[PDB]
Amino acid sequence: PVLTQSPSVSAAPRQRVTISVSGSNSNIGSNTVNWIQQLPGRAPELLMCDDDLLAPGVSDRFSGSRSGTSASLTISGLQSEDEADYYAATWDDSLNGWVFGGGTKVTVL
Amino acid sequence: MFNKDQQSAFYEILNMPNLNEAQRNGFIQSLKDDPSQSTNVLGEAKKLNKCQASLKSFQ
Secondary structure (H helix, E strand, C coil): CEEEEEEEEEEECCCCCCEEEEECCCCCCCCCCCEEEECCCCCCCCEEECCCCCCCCCCCEEEEEEEEEEEEEEEECCCCHCEEEEEEEEECCCCCCEECCCEEEEECC | CCCCHHHHHHHHHHCCCCCCHHHHHHHHHHHCCCCHHHHHHHHHHHHHHHHHHHHHHHH
């Protein structure tokens, strides 16, 4: 995977969890990051667009940012339905195409 | 879509192919409910249409 995401984590309900991703100057350093949520046994869907814009219907418990070659997703008030594989996506100017992280699994204890 | 800005954003959103039906319907509902937000709605819809292309390439 072109982007490196933070390791899979377990957290208790109501905890705050931050997932992070690192890229290069050609992807995250020059383009906005999207976050994809892949619920267990379900097709992936868009969670966050353009660093920090919630996809329609997504809870404002999710927030995103980007800084330098890094971006992060934070989940506030963690709830069992948030247990999922989270994937960073961004345009890479060098590949002239989409690049992805390998995914970070959030397990709700 | 009573005013020029509403009408213009409406047709741009109808023609964004990567939005699913719920997303598209939600943006057009916003244009009707909040005409002053037409410019912000259209910009959010264009972003989401581009982001939805990354989701398509991920599957």
